């Protein structure tokens, strides 16, 4: 339970003092200061830093609202965020939405009621109520991962539309026909859907129609990649190329194909998305594209950091990154 | 920055009434209570719920302090925490510590200054002050994952010493001699070290020892497991079993061996720890032991939830889970 009337018995000081020192209030000699502070540090007493008004006087909490920590996209984004804010000032905290508009709305509401200093949130699609909240927050807001839309305030991401188009072009160039696509967390993941639309736009444009497609509404996973790939290949045995919404499922498909002794890319080419580290420990190098996860995280915390230092900041807020396709050895012939 | 006045003018009622609807203090009819709430949502207004000082008045935040989100262990614990708190008015928030004591203390301090309603923190080893804060807090505190040492308050986990000891029992029994051990994130990960210890013991008491051993200071990685394993069969090509600190690196080693066309557990068997979903997508089924990730998180949340609704309750706060080894391929023989 421990409280103030306890820092006194140790600090041995009146009652009055303790406060005047904990929040840098009065003068108090350089000795009486580190006198009570060190007394409370022995007890484990931590000053109440939240007791305070609405905006203007906010807590050092930076709200990081993302869809999932189960893939391997955001763990890296958060790592970027931390490095930048590690310059002890603001404290990043993560809230998970599971891609549900409804839960994103409920989570942002909760965190906003705590009066944070900043908000870093994933994607550009939100419910009407959630969008209204990000608009009426008197604090900086950085929407991350996607730049195929209209940001509320700040933005840092890549164009998923492009990601899809580029991959489709490289595959057409490489000479594949009879494609086939597999994606997870659909239709909830708006970015994966955009990548698929970019892909689709180019193929049709060149008179090509995807031969087969498999969409799973649940989460990404290695097992799911093996399952979908084997199911699709039995359904459409003559496909020469498989495009996955992400590296994880692609990895699962890779291991299944190799296990079946199929020639990659001789018979079948493959490509995924995100360029996660896990790709470096596989027997073959999967074609993919870097989602720029680390940089997006560092840059997002970079904005919020400046904004809070110099209100009149006056610096770039909407950043669009353009990663390149890592070809590996599963696409080019 | 929107204010009550904004909600009042768009609602048609007095700020005093808006406040009573929001602070849920009045006796306002549901017709006007609904008109006010409906107006707050159109505007994007979020009520400041941080008007409570120190002990007695806490925010509805649940501090979830863990070391990493980059392994494949904690995202799952978090899912379990979320499932249980889904019902409640509590909102879990995560803080990463990178396994560093000094940093765990900084994160714990910051969050404790926001006066949370509960704390879920990984492990039993904390700095002097960090441990003191946890005990000075007047809230439910649950230490998760490790059940070895002594807790400050609540606890949910497994004995990592037992884990290593059990995996040693099964290994020796199957005939293996000349064991190799690979670990990652040591000496930062106390729990992995505890597993290595119980593993050693059973082996030393049976007159057996690790032929080749390599500890790694960095993070788990499928690629790292791959490199490590290759540098060990090149250094000591006569090993017959490889025990890994976690499944991530084990999976890397596994793929490598099957790539080298060797038989498992024919020429050499292998095992890990955690039992991550990723294992489900591999060509062979790696022997390992469940870390009870999901269950631990649900149970920690449950403890915090029940101790918040009825501080007088009296419930099981010290829980030790006992998972059993998961065989299949790679070990039995």
XYZ file of C-alpha atoms in Angstrom, chain A residues 1-4 41-55 57-62 69-72 75-76 78-79 82 85-86 88-96 98 103 105-115 128-129 132-134 136-138 220-224 226 248 252 255 259 277-284, chain B residues 1-4 37 41-55 57 59-62 69-72 75-76 78-79 82 85-86 88-96 98 103 105-115 129 132-138 220-224 226 248 252 255 259 277-284:
168
model
C 0.000 0.000 0.000
C 2.891 2.288 1.057
C 2.533 6.097 0.843
C 3.855 9.597 1.632
C 14.141 4.949 -3.678
C 14.945 2.576 -0.814
C 11.246 2.091 -0.161
C 10.121 1.774 -3.762
C 7.843 4.801 -3.621
C 7.262 6.245 -7.075
C 5.914 9.806 -7.532
C 2.419 10.201 -8.967
C 3.182 11.624 -12.425
C -0.308 11.282 -13.906
C -2.380 13.232 -11.380
C -3.061 16.205 -13.633
C -5.341 18.025 -16.091
C -6.296 17.296 -19.701
C -4.079 18.439 -22.595
C -0.234 18.873 -18.984
C 0.073 15.318 -20.325
C 1.936 12.190 -19.234
C 5.164 11.059 -20.882
C 3.257 8.151 -22.477
C 3.509 7.600 -26.245
C 2.755 -8.785 -32.480
C 2.397 -12.384 -33.660
C 3.831 -11.798 -37.121
C 7.345 -10.372 -37.292
C 8.376 -6.211 -33.296
C 10.959 -4.508 -35.515
C 8.671 -1.025 -32.050
C 12.415 -1.670 -31.831
C 12.494 2.550 -28.840
C 12.874 7.552 -27.756
C 15.510 5.674 -25.715
C 14.744 8.969 -21.992
C 11.954 11.504 -22.312
C 8.841 9.742 -23.581
C 7.787 6.180 -22.771
C 6.425 4.137 -25.698
C 3.684 1.610 -24.858
C 2.006 -0.869 -27.168
C -1.671 -1.626 -27.601
C -2.871 -4.483 -29.837
C -6.002 -7.657 -33.861
C -11.036 -2.887 -31.029
C -11.446 2.243 -31.638
C -11.780 0.958 -28.062
C -8.008 0.847 -27.475
C -7.271 4.348 -28.814
C -10.120 5.709 -26.703
C -8.656 4.185 -23.527
C -5.148 5.403 -24.202
C -6.399 8.885 -25.125
C -8.279 9.109 -21.815
C -4.881 8.823 -20.088
C -3.791 12.015 -21.908
C -15.597 7.049 -38.175
C -15.401 7.345 -34.394
C -12.671 11.623 -35.175
C -10.596 10.855 -32.078
C -7.279 11.156 -33.935
C -9.522 15.958 -32.120
C -6.392 14.863 -30.232
C -4.377 17.981 -29.520
C -0.233 -15.787 -40.695
C 1.896 -18.813 -39.821
C 4.371 -21.259 -41.280
C 1.933 -24.203 -41.087
C -0.721 -22.204 -42.918
C 2.357 -25.325 -46.161
C 5.865 -16.300 -43.132
C 5.869 -22.500 -45.262
C 9.602 -25.876 -47.297
C 10.163 -31.330 -49.560
C 15.052 -11.904 -40.719
C 13.627 -15.434 -40.624
C 14.244 -15.471 -44.388
C 18.018 -15.567 -43.777
C 17.882 -18.957 -42.065
C 16.109 -20.858 -44.858
C 17.730 -23.253 -47.418
C 16.765 -21.015 -50.340
C -7.817 20.412 -28.338
C -11.528 19.848 -27.725
C -13.171 20.596 -24.384
C -16.391 19.957 -22.484
C -22.367 10.425 -25.468
C -18.413 10.523 -30.533
C -19.237 12.781 -33.482
C -16.753 15.350 -32.136
C -14.105 12.835 -31.205
C -14.055 13.809 -27.560
C -12.370 11.497 -25.066
C -13.036 12.099 -21.341
C -9.985 12.570 -19.129
C -10.115 9.541 -16.826
C -6.982 10.490 -14.910
C -8.386 12.620 -12.088
C -7.196 10.239 -9.369
C -4.176 10.771 -7.118
C -1.835 8.118 -5.660
C -3.192 5.075 -3.825
C -7.291 6.340 -7.382
C -5.932 4.439 -13.935
C -7.413 1.392 -15.690
C -4.010 0.462 -17.129
C -2.364 -2.940 -16.793
C 8.581 -9.274 -28.666
C 11.119 -10.528 -31.186
C 11.454 -14.136 -30.010
C 8.098 -15.862 -30.552
C 3.286 -12.237 -28.291
C 1.363 -15.361 -27.218
C -0.054 -11.179 -24.460
C -2.871 -12.836 -26.418
C -5.891 -9.819 -23.695
C -9.080 -8.645 -19.881
C -11.376 -8.355 -22.926
C -13.060 -6.172 -17.889
C -12.698 -2.399 -18.051
C -8.934 -2.937 -17.795
C -6.599 -2.172 -20.697
C -3.231 -3.959 -20.921
C -0.266 -2.059 -22.315
C 3.195 -3.438 -23.108
C 6.701 -2.208 -22.368
C 9.809 -3.914 -23.758
C 15.460 -5.927 -23.905
C 16.021 -0.689 -18.416
C 13.740 -0.386 -13.788
C 13.294 2.696 -15.996
C 10.205 1.293 -17.736
C 8.726 0.034 -14.479
C 9.297 3.430 -12.847
C 7.625 5.388 -15.637
C 4.600 3.132 -15.753
C 4.304 3.022 -11.986
C 4.153 6.827 -12.025
C 0.981 6.630 -14.086
C -0.545 4.717 -11.180
C 14.978 -0.627 -6.613
C 11.319 -2.427 -4.087
C 8.909 -0.555 -6.376
C 7.064 -3.799 -7.109
C 6.595 -4.320 -3.386
C 5.732 -0.700 -2.543
C 3.036 -0.689 -5.240
C -0.410 -1.060 -3.708
C 17.285 -15.826 -31.235
C 17.235 -16.235 -34.997
C 16.557 -19.064 -37.397
C 19.749 -18.063 -39.232
C 21.766 -17.922 -36.031
C 21.829 -22.469 -38.604
C 13.813 -20.674 -33.021
C 17.469 -23.334 -37.992
C 16.659 -27.334 -41.530
C 19.717 -30.072 -45.942
C 3.572 -22.539 -33.488
C 6.363 -22.178 -36.030
C 7.410 -25.753 -35.245
C 4.057 -26.880 -36.669
C 5.158 -25.756 -40.119
C 8.493 -27.564 -40.304
C 9.278 -30.722 -42.352
C 9.917 -32.745 -39.198
